[PDB]
Symmetry: D2
Subunit: 341 residues, 4 copies
């Protein structure tokens, strides 16, 4: 009979309905259709196709799908972002990072669970670009707050694992005296960083290198940074190379630059903390973030584990802060301002 089955089916596949919506919103941003709709206000599929070099029948299908979900409006003149569509604008970075960067990673979990199957891969170009977009809201203001509390003023800034260079673009625009250097090991992210710096008119003040963090510190250069930012990069080194390697890397930084101010941003691993995981942002963001870190070659640890690593590396904590409670009130994103002990 299957009595009452349909009502249970509609609820049972609600995650699938939102799964397709999340990928469709990601493409709406990533293909620049979102930016096109903002600029044109109303655009026919023909006009959007001519501008972005797309095929009309496929574009009309995406637009009809989004209109059925209320993201777009359709009039005789074409399609436009609805109020709900416009409201998505600030969240671009989260879609780019988690869908663009990590969709393949989540899809690989079944095969990667097998004994000896290795780490799930990701699209590190989208992870870096998306992460930088998110950092505009949480990590960049946290880094700015920590920088203002250091005894010295920043004049030469080094950002290792810089993604598309958004921290350097924001700090340099706000603080005109700064000269900066970013290192990004992902080739795609490195190319986006060189492009962003050029587009912002900062190429005379900011250089980007295609390099990993450890290899950059082992390389030869005359730049003498007074600040180094490690935004969510130490846990990647921790997973990739191990704890002794992280301690040695931090020791190398203060051996080479004894007067440097280090700003480290990390996520506290509270995956197994029942109360922390009930916060709406811990469930929407941190729960999938913790899951992907169990399948990739990256290792999140607790606030106390980081403090112990800093002590072992011969670093003193100047101050520790979490993000503004207006953007992320979980207390899981922590910034540390450190100096040589």
């Amino acid at each position: 009979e299957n009595t009452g089955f349909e009502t249970t089916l509609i609820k049972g596949i609600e995650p699938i309905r939102q799964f397709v919506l999340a990928i469709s919103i990601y493409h709406l941003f990533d293909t620049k259709l979102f930016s096109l709709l903002i600029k044109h206000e109303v655009a026919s599929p023909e006009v959007a196709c001519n501008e972005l070099g797309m095929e009309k029948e496929k574009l009309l299908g995406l637009f009809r799908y989004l209109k059925n979900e209320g993201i777009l409006l359709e009039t005789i003149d074409g399609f436009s972002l609805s109020k709900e569509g416009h409201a998505l604008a600030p969240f671009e970075g989260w879609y780019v990072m988690l869908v663009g960067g990590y969709a393949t990673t989540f899809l690989q979990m079944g095969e990667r669970l097998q004994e000896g199957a290795g780490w799930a891969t990701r699209d590190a170009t989208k992870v870096g670009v998306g992460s930088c977009g998110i950092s505009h809201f949480d990590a960049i203001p946290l880094t700015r707050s920590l920088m203002a509390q250091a005894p010295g003023t920043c004049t030469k800034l080094l950002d290792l694992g810089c993604g598309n260079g958004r921290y350097l673009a924001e700090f340099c625009k706000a603080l005109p005296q700064i000269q900066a250097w970013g290192a990004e090991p992902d080739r795609g992210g490195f190319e986006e960083a060189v492009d962003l710096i050029e587009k912002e008119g900062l190429s005379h003040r900011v250089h980007i290198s295609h390099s990993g963090a450890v290899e950059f510190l082992d390389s030869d250069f005359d730049f003498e940074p007074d600040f180094i930012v490690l935004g969510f990069v130490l846990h990647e080194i921790l997973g990739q190379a191990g704890r002794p390697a992280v301690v040695n890397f931090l020791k190398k930084i203060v051996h080479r630059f004894p007067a440097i101010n280090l700003i480290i941003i990390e996520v506290d691993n509270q995956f197994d903390n029942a109360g922390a995981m009930r916060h709406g942002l811990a469930l929407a963001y941190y729960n999938p973030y913790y899951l992907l870190h169990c399948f990739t070659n990256q290792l999140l640890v607790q606030d106390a584990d980081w403090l112990d690593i800093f002590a072992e590396a011969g670093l003193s904590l100047v101050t520790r802060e979490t993000t503004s409670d207006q953007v992320d009130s979980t207390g899981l994103e922590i910034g540390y301002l450190l100096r040589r002990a």
Copy 2:
């Protein structure tokens, strides 16, 4: 200031939270962890790992993620499906089809929108296995209803595009006189069909061929089916080969078997019908289904377009029915019972 940003962020990325949940539920089913939890009732990560050949730290991460979402319970003895987890059991086919089969397809939409980029690919093995799982609820009962209304009793059944052979397994178990033949062009789906038929003890009554529908009808065989089922296959032929090819294929069927009863199941294309698209199942299932058909080499048309194709092919409609309103009340899934005019 970003005043009130976090509350908007939690709602803004709700599709991403459910996107990861949908992929995680898909793996819970696909890896056989769901079946293991049903059998064991409670299982430690060590016990599940030993049984399925998995790695404990990755499995513990998936289990902790699912426990945070309420799908699993954790006690000192291990993990178990919660009431919410158990409730997911009937929906396996939808997760396997839409996530397993079509996740890559949705992820390809951005690149496939470009002029000349071609059709998005899919994992046709998962599409066929998942589709057969869904058909247990909607299309198999619809096919059974249409078969009972035909003038002749079924003795030799041909199922073209059979997936894992679930229609043949269900009809043969319920109707012991039937001999059946299935054709599935996807190698993976064909192998699952041979395995399912063997596991059900039906290899003496059901044969499966690795073949497409048109090529199967052009092949040489002595089998004289009195019923042919085309469950969601004509729209694939329509997209792949065009309307004249579909008409010629239908004409070939009644030329070769003039007394045959044809049962065709298709989805009515009402993507642009405002009222139809507000039904909860049209939004959860048919909206993403219509979207994927704009990006793959398959073409959905309306009920009237199908009736016109049948008239052109020299077929008469015996009866037309939609699915039981207890499982799918949209009126979009339509079954046609046809014979030679």
Copy 3:
């Protein structure tokens, strides 16, 4: 142990969380706080209190509650409507009708289920005001569409069960030549109608009477309307007085005004129609609407039952239409344009 109980509790009481939010949004509109926030942009509790004659500690509690739900933003200068709060503006009529008018009705259902307990009461003033607010979107445009299909021109309009007189105000602003008369039996609704007509500068063109529909038609007056509108009033007469009374009332209308055009708006009773009840607006609005109509002295019947009543009353159907699919695509709200047979 209550293992995993909290996650089930948060979902289990989700209807209670939204129950309080719905009442709070209703008060935000009804107390004029919503209009105050629109005008001031930002207001401290002190400023809102002084303007509306409210108590600061209670107002701060409502504001903090709404801020936690994201309806309001709080800055050093005070509270403001968020983008989410602004987006609620068009829905005022639904909150005023279903919460203001019918909260007491839903709350009485437990006691009214008892044998001989009678009909649940409602706040008919809020039902009329709220219903008129809703009608701006659905029923007024439907009435306008039906009026344009009638032969001749409207010069004298009679609206029986007019609520706050919104149809008369809207029709008088679009058709500056018409004179109008409204009858509303609820004293509160009648007083709101006299006030709305005066505020719109229409008192020289529109008269309102405190009267029921049947009693108005039995009264003495020289007004010769060429159009009579019965917007969701016949089913109230049907419940209150019975089917013979409705037929007699309709007969009386065309006996007194043989050349009149009648426009009747009614809701088709499809409470027991599985497919109809899966539409998102059927669940959000029509399911509670049907429930209220089982506990109040009002009777909804099917489209065919209305057509039979019109035939028995000696009326002929000129045309029948449903609402625009841009506002209500259920097909449940039906407008009939009738004349004497």
Copy 4:
């Protein structure tokens, strides 16, 4: 044109859809229909009507409404609780308290905001019965944990503001040696307490008095309790009588019983704490709870304010605990075990 209005309307009035569902679930429990469906498994409206003395057409309306929402299933034999309906069972206390006890309170907020309008009323019988139902999960296990940490053994227990006496029934069933006395000032709650104690076969061990807490301590009796429980009652006395009255009341307790162990359960007022208010249970339960406490004659204060009151009353804190993180992980429900300083 109202382009795309319907999709915005369905989301805009989602709180109203859940508002009606919450009231309907409350009645399903309160009228004993939920218990009837559990016992019968399947019941026709006629059978439920005959058993509970209800009217068939109204009951059929409630049942059809619930079936459309998936709470009930309908077969030829009648209606039954679906899996979703069965899953509601543990949450009865929350529906009885917040809907039964406080629906009138939320509905009065608009009028009670006016200067000099006084405190909103509530149905204290439903608040006490509902609160006791909730306490089975959170506060009773917390009280049991605190009792086990006190020196000696409980033999005489006094519960002031006992509601329906559920703590006394549960403590008497787990500790068969204890005698108990409860005081409840609400007449309805007092009568439910006398009935519950009798139904549990505990009338020879447990006495209930119709009295407030302060008046009970001022009355004459020979009972010498070694434990007194004040479960969510001190904040009611605080609002009703003021801080000096609460301090005097606590002083009176240890003056009369110098060796007594006091167990006080209170909710920490973190209404204005951004991070606390993002927890799913803080939004679902504590946000409406805080709102009700701004409109009723009850005052919630912070953990530090309670500790200060205890110090001023001459009490010393033995231990302080929050609820099990399996049921309530907000840290907002706090239990204090106190003794004379």
